[PDB]
Amino acid sequence: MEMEKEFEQIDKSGSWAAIYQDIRHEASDFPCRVAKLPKNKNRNRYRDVSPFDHSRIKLHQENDYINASLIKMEEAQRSYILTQGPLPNTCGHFWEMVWEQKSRGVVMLNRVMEKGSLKCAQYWPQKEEKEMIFEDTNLKLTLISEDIKSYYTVRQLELENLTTQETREILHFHYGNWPDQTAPESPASFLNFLFKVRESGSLSPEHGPVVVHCSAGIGRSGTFCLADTCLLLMDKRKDPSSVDIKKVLLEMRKFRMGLIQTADQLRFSYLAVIEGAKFIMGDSSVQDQWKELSHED
Ligand SMILES: [Mg+2]
Numbered sequence: 001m002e003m004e005k006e007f008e009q010i011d012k013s014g015s016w017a018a019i020y021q022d023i024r025h026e027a028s029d030f031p032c033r034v035a036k037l038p039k040n041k042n043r044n045r046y047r048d049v050s051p052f053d054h055s056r057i058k059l060h061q062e063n064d065y066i067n068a069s070l071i072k073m074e075e076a077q078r079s080y081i082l083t084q085g086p087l088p089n090t091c092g093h094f095w096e097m098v099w100e101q102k103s104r105g106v107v108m109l110n111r112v113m114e115k116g117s118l119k120c121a122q123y124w125p126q127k128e129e130k131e132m133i134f135e136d137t138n139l140k141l142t143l144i145s146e147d148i149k150s151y152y153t154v155r156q157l158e159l160e161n162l163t164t165q166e167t168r169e170i171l172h173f174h175y176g177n178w179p180d181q182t183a184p185e186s187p188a189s190f191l192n193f194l195f196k197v198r199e200s201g202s203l204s205p206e207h208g209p210v211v212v213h214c215s216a217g218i219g220r221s222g223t224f225c226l227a228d229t230c231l232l233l234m235d236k237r238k239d240p241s242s243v244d245i246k247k248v249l250l251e252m253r254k255f256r257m258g259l260i261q262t263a264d265q266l267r268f269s270y271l272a273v274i275e276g277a278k279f280i281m282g283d284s285s286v287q288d289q290w291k292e293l294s295h296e297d
Pocket residue numbers: 002003006243244245246
């Protein structure tokens with residue numbers, strides 16, 4: 001409620017840049033000493049995007065480094081793992097993390113090729129008959145089925161620990177038309193996708209944290225997690241007025257640097273949370289309107 005008042009004030013004064021820059025100025029600064037060790041330089045996609053030591057995900061091998069952060073939202077009681085798009089040499093590490101952390105969903109917000117460059121390795125199989133074996137981490141990954149919609153794809157993957165022969169279903173939610181440094185095309189399209197992730201059960205507290213990534217794992221990934229956390233806070237309290245979006249973002253930034261990369265992504269987060277509030281507060285039919293407005297079919 002007060003977020004909507006604030007939204008119109010900021011819009012009327014045209015001060016989204018200033019609001020966003022103040023968040024950048026106030027954001028936490030913690031050491032990333034492990035990420036900057038020389039032996040880990042080839043495990044980082046971007047020189048300037050590193051996990052803090054205190055919140056980094058540790059692999060359970062005896063080099064434990066992956067560029068990934070546990071965003072542990074204590075008040076909302078939901079956690080997320082935000083990570084970079086894996087590199088050709090860290091795809092085994094990526095799936096090892098998925099296994100060890102007991103995640104059941106992977107949210108991919110980027111394409112492997114963007115703006116003429118490779119922003120993420122091809123870390124999952126594109127054909128049923130060409131499964132992937134990660135020899136370094138003793139994991140096998142098979143495409144089971146996929147559901148291709150107009151702007152996103154949902155894939156059913158089977159991940160097998162070859163040491164124990166345990167298998168798990170992993171759901172892959174792949175957003176197709178959300179470029180870096182931009183907001184999604186519409187709140188409807190974004191919320192339709194977010195609530196597809198929610199409906200899957202992948203965010204259940206009975207599972208490990210969902211894994212969310214884009215190329216760097218901070219911009220689109222931070223936008224996704226900020227919207228979800230704000231909606232969850234509002235949901236637990238049944239009180240949209242009680243949510244302070246900038247406070248929530250600053251809290252998320254205690255766990256990973258740079259979350260939300262542009263002022264328009266911050267503005268979009270307000271838009272998405274204000275619209276999603278309608279569903280949270282009991283206008284259930286609005287979810288059907290998002291699906292129609294998203295033209296997913
Ligand atoms: Mg506010």
